[PDB]
Design a protein around this ligand. Structure first.
Ligand SMILES: O=C(O)CCc1nc2cc(Cl)ccc2s1
Ligand SMILES: [Zn+2]
Ligand SMILES: [Zn+2]
Ligand SMILES: [Zn+2]
Length: 101
């Protein structure tokens, strides 16, 4: 690989004290498949191969960075790239613990 930095990492917000639920369904269509969590507002929406609700959320909010609940990758919609950075480690780890632990 991912980009080791991107100019949208500044928009990554603190993780809610409720933590993450990697089984959370899409907030629009309720699908349990291929969801992502927004790293600005922590809403959960489905991927491009389901109903494209996270891409819609990007369009209507401008929020840049999203975390996959399938493989814990982080995608930036502006840079059109995967990103990994020390600034993403806390949220990936919280997600990894919820998913696997
Ligand atoms: O599915 C989503 O809306 C968000 C996440 C991603 N969007 C893309 C688009 C391409 Cl072209 C390749 C990889 C990814 S990861
Ligand atoms: Zn959806
Ligand atoms: Zn958002
Ligand atoms: Zn970016």
């Amino acid at each position: 690989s991912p980009l080791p930095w991107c100019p949208h990492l500044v928009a990554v917000c603190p993780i809610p004290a409720a933590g993450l639920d990697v089984t959370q369904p899409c907030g629009d269509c309720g699908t349990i498949q291929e969801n992502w969590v927004c790293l600005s507002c922590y809403q959960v929406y489905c991927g491009r191969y389901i109903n494209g609700h996270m891409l819609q959320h990007h369009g209507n909010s401008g929020h840049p960075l999203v975390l996959s609940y399938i493989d814990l990758s982080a995608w930036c919609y502006y840079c059109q790239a995967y990103v990994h950075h020390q600034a993403l480690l806390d949220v990936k780890n919280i997600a990894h613990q919820n998913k696997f632990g």
